[PDB]
Symmetry: D2
């Protein structure tokens, strides 16, 4: 440090154009202003519940491929925030849109949803803990910069309905999760070759592409 | 009643119909497809096949029976090693460097990622079901294009049609069909539905692959 | 039900002779009476901490291979009981034997330890959720019948040092964990062929053999 | 300094020494080993090789480079397909049924489970390191037994010694050695220590395998 290349910053820069497209996407801008049609948001949070279920499985690969109790613990904690969290952003909107437990059980993921979660899983499974750390990063990191951007429109945070979502993904606690993921990737890659770095960049960019397509399909509901 | 292979076939015939009548695919059968689109397809399919071979290696690790281990191992070799793609690598002027530098498209990565992930989350049944659409649909596509006519006699496209409708290719598909049937005779109703879901998801990806290939 | 074969009972019966050998093993009988040399127990709880770390990874395979939120949640909860449980039986003896965090970090698993955890992992990875459910069952189930047996010597529960261990593995809460694992295996195998059942039996017996060898190596410390 | 392959070799030479001088192994080299113990070994090693091939399939799935995918795939075929075990299947009277009904011993299952688990938890480096001891130690064992003499000329045991000291077998070991070296030139000190730990763990399992084979 700090005359040395940081791989997280390198991945960040390569994903900027894509995350900018996510920020100005009609679905996301709809959340910021408060104009997004309420059933389009409903469709999204159902799809996102399904998405989060598969996302948890990638973190579980983290537990298996981590060789360090502390990082196993960190991956295990991330799974709990998805599965055992009645305070989570998702369980808030589930009761606000009065979505039934049977509707959740009966819902099908869209192709765009399946493709994304398959990609993270398959790359996790073909690689090591570096690939799992890189595969899960776009999702949290992009949601953070999206929410920090939306966090000033203004009235975006004060919105009676959509305020909770923007506040949730911009909170100090969610920041700490993204920071953990960033730090983990940086600490795992100190000795990585140029070719390895390019592999991780490719994963990070691909998942960023999937995020854009996820917002798209949520809007095209 | 009905074999599970036939049950999955029945539920995908509609998608395979759309594949057969796709501009790219009819393009092969009547020689209208532009060489530049087929070139792009061939590079992508090469990349595709490298990831597809991995699903078969997954079959080696999950097979708990020496006979099917061996069958999966031979399928890896067949995929890798007088291949259709080589012919077209030579016929077009695709270099070894061009192949190594090539990037798979989103549609390509999604499809192979999906087969891998389902294979890894499930058992030998799920890997057998995940790889079946690819082979079987090419067989029926090639059998359909075969009777156009002058499809087989075409100086450029003939080889592709001949290859995927051959006796040896049909035997590979038949192995995959019979394996799935023999792995599933004790499967519950819910298991069969899961396998059906995989088989139609992959058929959708096949359609998107041809589509992606046509956009170039 | 109940004129139908229960696969858990079938596995149980095939493992009885082995679990009986575990019950009357010098190490385990040492716990029951209270005579087990204290540094032999120390060696064991270090090895068992290492063991539990790998055991958690098998439960993580459970999260990835479960296709049902409820069972994912159940596997995730099991991981937490290993990693985020300062009330766990292990963290009790860690402070009682004043075992340092650095000693835990520096400790090597024995072959017998490595072999067992490798076997559960590899079978989990080669199979489906049925194999993971079968691979983790011996450990909890044998510890339960061991503790229920030791639970009457008497004075075994009242022992100032070893009492905590016997009480812990015989508690209503640990019973509920074993019951969950048993129920899960039974519900996953309703349609299993004879050949599949034999595969799961073989896993269950093998892990039972490893348990006996684990106690052995803990005694031969 | 030193190649990592040589570094692992150095740290295991002591265990391989114990393997070379083991009663079972010296038994092969001087024709004293009883046919019944070798028969038992051959059934076990067959079972062993079936699981070992799976670690190589794991190499196919984790190789992110077409050349090494192909090398791993060929290694699966070589393991499966004029094999040493076949010769001894025929020479002794081991039936196809006897092989299918055979159970691997604890020592057998532990060893293969260990290679699988480390391969799956890690990357292509860890699979290359996990499979190396097996091939390399057999090479040095066979090279040692070769000069006894009359070891090679022995009517029963000659073939085994000839096979594991052959040009083609040495080339397989050399591939595995060179692959590990080329996969690790950017590895940190801690990574090298991890790989060393795997390599000596597997060497210990090799010793326990010969031991298990001698107990029958």
């Amino acid at each position: 440090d700090p005359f040395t290349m940081q791989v997280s910053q390198y991945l960040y820069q390569n994903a900027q154009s894509i995350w900018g497209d996510c920020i100005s996407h009609p679905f996301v801008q709809g959340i910021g202003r408060g104009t997004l049609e309420r059933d389009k948001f409903r469709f999204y949070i159902i799809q996102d519940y399904l998405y989060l279920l598969e996302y948890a499985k990638v973190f579980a690969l983290g537990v298996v491929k981590a060789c360090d109790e502390a990082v196993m613990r960190e991956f295990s904690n991330a799974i709990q925030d998805i599965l055992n969290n009645e305070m989570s952003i998702h369980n808030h909107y589930i009761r606000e849109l009065q979505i039934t437990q049977k509707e959740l059980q009966n819902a099908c993921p869209t192709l765009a949803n399946k493709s994304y979660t398959s990609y993270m899983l398959a790359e996790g499974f073909k690689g090591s803990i570096k690939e799992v750390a890189a595969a899960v990063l776009s999702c949290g990191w992009s949601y953070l910069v999206i929410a920090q951007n939306l966090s000033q429109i203004p009235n975006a945070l004060e919105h009676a309905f959509y305020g909770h979502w923007i506040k949730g993904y911009s909170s100090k606690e969610f920041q700490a999760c993204v920071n953990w993921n960033i730090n983990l990737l940086d600490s795992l890659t100190l000795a990585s070759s140029k070719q390895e770095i390019e592999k991780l960049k490719e994963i990070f960019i691909t998942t960023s592409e999937y995020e854009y397509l996820f917002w798209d399909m949520a809007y095209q509901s």
